[PDB]
Sequence to fold (1439 residues):
Amino acid sequence: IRFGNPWRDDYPEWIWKSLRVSRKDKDMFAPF
Amino acid sequence: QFHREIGKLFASYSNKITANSPVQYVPSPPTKGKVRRALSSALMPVWFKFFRGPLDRWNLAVMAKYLRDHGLMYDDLYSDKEPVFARALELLPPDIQAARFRRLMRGTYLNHLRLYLPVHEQNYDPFIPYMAPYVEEAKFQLQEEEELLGYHMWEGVWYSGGVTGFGDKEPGEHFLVALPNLYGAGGSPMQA
Amino acid sequence: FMSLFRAHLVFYRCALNLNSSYNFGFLVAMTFVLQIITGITLAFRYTSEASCAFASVQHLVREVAAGWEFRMLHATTASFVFLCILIHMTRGLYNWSYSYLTTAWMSGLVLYLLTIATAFLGYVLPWGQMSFWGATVITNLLSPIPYLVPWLLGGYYVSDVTLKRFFVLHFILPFIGCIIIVLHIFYLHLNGSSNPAGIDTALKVAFYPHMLMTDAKCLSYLIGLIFLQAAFGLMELSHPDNSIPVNRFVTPLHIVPEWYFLAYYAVLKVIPSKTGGLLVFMSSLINLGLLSEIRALNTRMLIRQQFMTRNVVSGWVIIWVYSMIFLIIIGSAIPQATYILYGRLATILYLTTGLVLCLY
Amino acid sequence: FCGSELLHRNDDMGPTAHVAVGFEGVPWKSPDAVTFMLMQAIVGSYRKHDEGIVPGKVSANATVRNVCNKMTVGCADMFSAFNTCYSDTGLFGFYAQCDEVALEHCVMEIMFGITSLSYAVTDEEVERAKAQLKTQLLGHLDSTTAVAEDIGRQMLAYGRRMPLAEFLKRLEVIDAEEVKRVAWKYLHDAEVAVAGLGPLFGMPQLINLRRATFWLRY
Amino acid sequence: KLEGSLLPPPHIPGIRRAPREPASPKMAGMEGRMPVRLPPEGSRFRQYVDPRADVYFPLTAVLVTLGPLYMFSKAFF
Amino acid sequence: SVHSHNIRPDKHELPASEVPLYYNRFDQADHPSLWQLEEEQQRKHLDQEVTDVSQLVEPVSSPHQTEGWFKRLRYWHYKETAEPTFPRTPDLSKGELAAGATVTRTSVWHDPNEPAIVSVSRFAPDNFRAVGFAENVPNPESTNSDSHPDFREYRLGPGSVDRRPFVYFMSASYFFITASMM
Amino acid sequence: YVGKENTKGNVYEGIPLDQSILEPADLRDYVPPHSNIQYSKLDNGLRIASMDRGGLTASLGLFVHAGTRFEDVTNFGVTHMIQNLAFASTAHLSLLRTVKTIEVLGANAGCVVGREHLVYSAECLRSHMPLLVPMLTGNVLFPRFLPWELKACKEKLIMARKRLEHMPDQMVSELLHTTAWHNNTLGHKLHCTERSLGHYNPDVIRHYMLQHFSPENMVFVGVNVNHDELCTWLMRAFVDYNAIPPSKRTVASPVYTGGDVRLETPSPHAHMAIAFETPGGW
Amino acid sequence: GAPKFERKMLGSYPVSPEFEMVWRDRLTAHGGYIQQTISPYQLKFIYPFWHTFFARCWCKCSAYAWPWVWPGLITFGLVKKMNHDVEEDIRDHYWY
Ligand SMILES: CCCCCCCCCCCCCCCCCC(=O)OC[C@H](COP(=O)([O-])OCC(O)COP(=O)([O-])OC[C@@H](COC(=O)CCCCCCCCCCCCCCCCC)OC(=O)CCCCCCCCCCCCCCCCC)OC(=O)CCCCCCCCCCCCCCCCC
Ligand SMILES: CCCCCCCCCCCCCCCCCC(=O)OC[C@H](COP(=O)([O-])OCC(O)COP(=O)([O-])OC[C@@H](COC(=O)CCCCCCCCCCCCCCCCC)OC(=O)CCCCCCCCCCCCCCCCC)OC(=O)CCCCCCCCCCCCCCCCC
Ligand SMILES: CCCCCCCCCCCCCCCCCC(=O)OC[C@H](COP(=O)([O-])OCC(O)COP(=O)([O-])OC[C@@H](COC(=O)CCCCCCCCCCCCCCCCC)OC(=O)CCCCCCCCCCCCCCCCC)OC(=O)CCCCCCCCCCCCCCCCC
Ligand SMILES: CCCCCCCCCCCCCCCCCC(=O)OC[C@H](COP(=O)([O-])OCC(O)COP(=O)([O-])OC[C@@H](COC(=O)CCCCCCCCCCCCCCCCC)OC(=O)CCCCCCCCCCCCCCCCC)OC(=O)CCCCCCCCCCCCCCCCC
Ligand SMILES: CCCCCCCCCCCCCCCCCC(=O)OC[C@H](COP(=O)([O-])OCC[N+](C)(C)C)OC(=O)CCCCCCCCCCCCCCCCC
Ligand code: HEM
Ligand code: HEM
Ligand SMILES: COc1cc2[nH]c(C)c(-c3ccc(Oc4ccc(OC(F)(F)F)cc4)cc3)c(=O)c2cc1Cl
Ligand SMILES: O=C1C(O)=C([C@H]2CC[C@H](c3ccc(Cl)cc3)CC2)C(=O)c2ccccc21
Fold:
């Protein structure tokens, strides 16, 4: 158990990956 | 003559204290009486194994992880609203000072975002004592001023110069000396 | 006075990481201003006579345009005054704000005392059963000194004279409040606010654009919630028993103060000696006052980080909060041996965890 | 002895104002003469230009210290106290030089000084003053001229010459309560005389200087 | 080689080095946890330290500091 | 400021020459300039890769320091209890610290082979640095971690619309609701 | 003064000053002291000279052979810095404690720079001599030169000349010197110029002192003190410590240039001076 | 507020009243720094919040578990046990 544990806490790998995603030079509401 | 008699009392007591003075370092008497030392020594094997041990280990784990998340050192927790530490910071050299400034900036930003650092950024010991040589000097310097100037309750002129008169040396730091002007543009103490 | 306005509320520079927990002061001030508006417009139609006060309050609701709205806004905003104050206090217990904001903390305590007094005086003016018997109880509680109680009452028992002077006092005290608020803010901005991180930092940012908008956002939420509760009545904040006319020779069969007074009530239920009762309040308030100079009670140099995150030990402030909530729970219930037993347990916790804050 | 002021206002001689304030003293032969010689030293002197090795802001003399810390810049160019004894009367007081806008503090600080002698002086200060007074007086009497002048002066003033041991023995036994007695006898709630020259727009009233001689505290 | 977060110092002429601790053998119960050091080898503390107790401590704290008060209260209040 | 210090003698807290709460091992240089060299000769823990929390280096200082009833925090460094007239002599053989009082009121700086004026010069507070200093003390290059997003992934670039209409419409909407309520 | 032991107060209260209070016990039959100079030397090299005239106040002075004529292009201004740092922190005393103690003993003390000498001196009652010998010798035995004292003491280097602008006579003196020996030895200025505030770091001060402040370049002189006590308390000062070791320094002959110089300012007189050299000097 | 050695200015122009608080809290930039900002009219401002939601929420919830919830659970326990004791009392004392 890493959650809430000062001996082990760290993000899950999928949370570390969610921060790598990119939407640079895209915009989906431009028509409005 | 009341005052001279009480003088005599004070003087004799002070002379007793003076006569017992050592001329060299002598180890301090223990902080606890022999009864409590005995009781602690008796209960050590249970108390340290079950309770004190884990408490003192959990504490350091908590502290270390919180400091590493943000990239602070331990001596980054002290303020400069504390006179001794203010002096210590005045005595610092350029490099240490600059690094402290940078770490405080980064810690502020990270606590704003509430994002952990990567674990490879957390590989350092946060509990190095980098302020000690300067805190000891500050303590010396601020102790001598008490000894040589602060030994009496000095008497002053009241509510003059922007200071209350009971000891302050910075203007308008107390309510009864607020609002120094009614017209004009004011001013600042640092530009006098 | 415009130049001061700009210096303190536009160009004043804060720390970047001030989150919502630092917005509740502004909020209590706003509930003050709002409560003052509704106060004054309620005074225009209230009657200060024991023979007819009750019906005077009923006339507003029944026969006056928008009569109901001002009474209910005034009644409900009080709860938010106290809720915001308690959040505001607990934040600074959590952070150890009083380490360097010494006089601000003292001023705070004085303002809280003012608010208690103001609320309790207000609570008597509608003149129902609960009002009369509450006044009786609290006036008997401060009896230790001869003749002080008939003097403050005006009379041998709670009377129309008592109503008249309570009304005038309730009129006056809030404005003294306002003056002390100015004093409060003087001490505050003399020093400068603390961070949630409890470090000193140069990453400051000005107030007007960034923090002003957060203040405004929370203000929207609070206005929302006040109107929700005021118009629809979701929670039974006030007991029904103040709806009954007064009788000087018969008590109500069940008794529950306003929630912000229940913990105190709990104490009066469980401590045997009446003087012990009163001394508990005096002692706890003195202990809170004592925190203003905590730097002197020890020779180790102090830090503001209490390292309560991820900590299995928790912290004395959290135990204090839970003890206080438990006391509210027990306050609410009937007098019975088991409730009293757990009452005494909770009371010991509440007293001890306050004493212990000084022992770093 | 008349309590009056005599002020020469003049704004065409630069920024500096000169002032002297005086009290009634005691004759040569008075028993308290020595105590007066000591009080003059307890108030002492100061110069902003030339200072020795002790900064004024940390000096043991409280009057100098209070003057040098005023408005953080300090409010006087020079001040010095004085005592003069005549055959049947004396003068006791001080002389000062200060800036046009500093004059008020420049004067009231030193009046506060002198009024302290009757309420709050302590033996640290008395012994410092004894040390400095002894250094001064015993330091002059080196050459033949100083000795001959002293012989003649004492011969006219006392009908004799007082030997060193007598002066030292009479000086030794004065403590704080004795100073606090004599001052209360002659200086508390007394008349004062004033003279000044220069940019005296700042100058205090005569009645201010006269009501200064007592404290309402205590 | 060395205990704790130290690394062997370079030999630089003009700098005087303090003595540094050699490494010590670790005990059972510290597998897979953020490491926190043990007492020195010649102390009295190292006779009674037991890392395996850090797992039950969240219960030990409550038992010790709140159970006796509960017992006393139920006995007398 | 309005804040005092609290330098006073104390019987619960022995002075720092007697019982320091920090880890009392310091290296000493003949001249602080030499500290430059070590910064370009040592290894550093932050130059090397780790992946799990269990691999982080372990603190040098002991967890077991502060004791007493109802003391949550178990670790501290600095205190202002006052020094005596004759302080405890530092033992430089064990790399203990010598600073302020312990330089002035002690023989610690004395050397048989060297002039006194030369000998005292090595005991300014810049001449001492803890053990582990060059290896553990961070010195950031930026406030931003390369593992977090900055403006580069949110900036509206070439080809984008103008948003002034939207911004001012947002705020006008807020205001007209506000005015109706008022 | 925590209370006072004697309660008798002013025992001569109310006695006029033309009425004696001496008892016959306090009379003496006068014996003069002997007032020819006494000469001694410590083992490390220090020379001591003393006289007594039976005065109550003593004069004490330490003389060092370190003037400004010994500086060079890398040193200019160092002697002024040292003088401006007199009675600052040393091995066993702080600056504050030193000056406050000198004040409370009642003494007057100071330091003076010339073109060939540096002098420290003090003065008060003769019974305080044992407490003054340390504070005078400290300055040459083991000063610390903490940076934050150098930095705070800097403005006094400039005021020294800023005051010369209203002392025309002294000004002309300095002009004469710098014109007579242009750019060498006695020609050097007695103050720190702007160019002199660069090398205001402890290492230059310390390296300069190591070349001049050895004992055999010093003299200690006392007037109105008993010589065996002076010798004893001076010996007890150098016994524990290593003094600055000797150096076989050499000194160059001044070169006299002469020349001419003018300096105009609103003074209402024409001040003029003409001079010629004395070959060989003292 | 700030220590006197930090609030000492380099300039000498008079501080205007409306800037009082600004220069009472002056601090030195030891070592200097470089900063960049983009006008909020040229940034996305609701996508950056949701893009970093899970990390922020993990951090916040992790930080509060032990200190706030565990004592909460214990208190909730105590309330349940008190209810038990009362519901047994009320029968012992008054039911035959
Ligand atoms: C608006 C105000 C009006 C304007 C004018 C100003 C008015 C003030 C006048 C009263 C003061 C008289 C006393 C003069 C003392 C002079 C001492 C001295 O040389 O000065 C240096 C000295 C400080 O130098 P320091 O020693 O270097 O500083 C170190 C610290 O002091 C730390 O030192 P330490 O830690 O080493 O400890 C030292 C401590 C050691 O001692 C203790 O700590 C003892 C503790 C024992 C507990 C018991 C309580 C002690 C306090 C007594 C209070 C009683 C007074 C009230 C009586 C009421 C009568 C009706 O020493 C003392 O306590 C000795 C002084 C105590 C005197 C306090 C009372 C004086 C009042 C006398 C007149 C009373 C009439 C009032 C009428 C009713 C209206 C108020 O000055 C003081 O210590 C100040 C003491 C006096 C208090 C400040 C005055 C108040 C100013 C603010 C006004 C607030 C008014 C609020 C009303 C607002 C209305 C809207
Ligand atoms: C979300 C929070 C809201 C707070 C509200 C407070 C109450 C306000 C009352 C007065 C009114 C004021 C109005 C303004 C409120 C503030 C607004 C605001 O800006 O909030 C910001 C708030 C948090 O902002 P932040 O920047 O994170 O704040 C900093 C943090 O505090 C972090 O600060 P830090 O990290 O620097 O920490 C400093 C420290 C400083 O210390 C403090 O401040 C401590 C203060 C504690 C309180 C002490 C006083 C207590 C006095 C006694 C009161 C008794 C009241 C009794 C009431 C009884 C009611 C029954 O604070 C803490 O430590 C706080 C952490 C506490 C953790 C506690 C964890 C508890 C877990 C509970 C789990 C429960 C599970 C149940 C499972 C059940 C299963 C059956 O964010 C939001 O609220 C976001 C907006 C969410 C909007 C959602 C709307 C949804 C609507 C849905 C409608 C659906 C319609 C469906 C229709 C369907 C049709 C078909
Ligand atoms: C409707 C409400 C209306 C309220 C109005 C109140 C008006 C009072 C004004 C206060 C006095 C002015 C303060 C300015 C001070 C300036 C700061 C300064 O540097 O002063 C240095 C100065 C110290 O002198 P120093 O530095 O040693 O050297 C002085 C110079 O050498 C030589 O001195 P100087 O030539 O430089 O002149 C100094 C002059 C500075 O002033 C001026 O230059 C301008 C003139 C001052 C204003 C004069 C008009 C005030 C009218 C007085 C009557 C008000 C009665 C109000 C009753 C309301 C009825 C509904 O100060 C004075 O002489 C003031 C003396 C009068 C104040 C003392 C009154 C307390 C008597 C308490 C007796 C016990 C009664 C208990 C029963 C309850 C009674 C309610 O400080 C003072 O002595 C000033 C007074 C300090 C306050 C003492 C404590 C007051 C509390 C009294 C007890 C409260 C009773 C409440 C209980 C209720 C029971 C039910
Ligand atoms: C007419 C009828 C008469 C009946 C008479 C009956 C009388 C009964 C009296 C019972 C007295 C019990 C206490 C004996 C103490 C002995 C002390 C001793 O020998 O010292 C030697 C010796 C003293 O030397 P020393 O130099 O002081 O060394 C010790 C260190 O200073 C220590 O510091 P350290 O650093 O080494 O250790 C860490 C430190 C620091 O640790 C921490 O800070 C950790 C804190 C973690 C807290 C985590 C909490 C998280 C959960 C929160 C949950 C939410 C709660 C709130 C909300 C709930 C809703 C309301 O730990 C502590 O501070 C431990 C505190 C323990 C408190 C225990 C309190 C027991 C109270 C019992 C009731 C008494 C009466 C109540 C009042 C009555 C009305 C006035 O100490 C030791 O060797 C250590 C001994 C420690 C013993 C602790 C455990 C005692 C267990 C007693 C069991 C009693 C059962 C009674 C049953 C009754 C049935 C009828
Ligand atoms: C002087 C007394 C005034 C009382 C106000 C009551 C008036 C009647 C009811 C409201 C009417 C509508 C509002 C007026 C129109 C808008 C003003 C305007 O022209 O916009 C200027 C500007 C509009 O800016 P903008 O950027 O939207 O657009 C202007 C730019 N152009 C023209 C290019 C589009 O408003 C501001 O910038 C105001 C800044 C503050 C915004 C947040 C305020 C929220 C509230 C904060 C806390 C409140 C508590 C403090 C009060 C004390 C009492 C409790
Ligand atoms: C912080 C400010 C205030 C607080 C906390 C407060 C609190 C209260 C409370 C709790 C009540 C009880 C109402 C009820 O039980 O229905 C009340 C009633 C009342 N308040 Fe205040 N009040 C404040 C300010 C004011 C002011 C400034 C005035 C007038 C100037 C005022 C006038 C009244 C009146 C007339 C009532 C009677 C309401 C009724 O009879 O229905 N209040 N107040
Ligand atoms: C009417 C009642 C009160 C008002 C109007 C008020 C107002 C404010 C305001 C506006 C602030 C600055 C912004 C903020 O913190 O939200 C503040 C800060 C503060 N207040 Fe209050 N407050 C009140 C009651 C209290 C109480 C009862 C206390 C303490 C018991 C208190 C102690 C503090 C402290 C310590 C701070 C600063 C904390 C820090 O900077 O870390 N205040 N107050
Ligand atoms: C989120 O972080 C913060 C929020 C903050 N919010 C506010 C509202 C202020 C503030 C309050 C009052 C003030 O000046 C006033 C005093 C008294 C008055 O009187 C009265 F009664 F309020 F109307 C009015 C006006 C000046 C500034 C802060 O300083 C403040 C500081 C921080 Cl860190
Ligand atoms: O029995 C009580 C009672 O005990 C109180 C109490 C509640 C706490 C109050 C209180 C206590 C302390 C403070 Cl600082 C402020 C208010 C005083 C009145 C009531 O409010 C009450 C109202 C109506 C009928 C009966 C009663």
Notes: The pocket of cardiolipin (ligand 1) is lined by residues B 153-155, 158, 166-167, 176 (CB under 6 Å). The helical segments of chain H are 20-24, 47-51, 53-94. Residues 37 and 43 of chain H are 10 Å apart (CA to CA). Chains H and D do not touch (no CB pair under 8 Å).
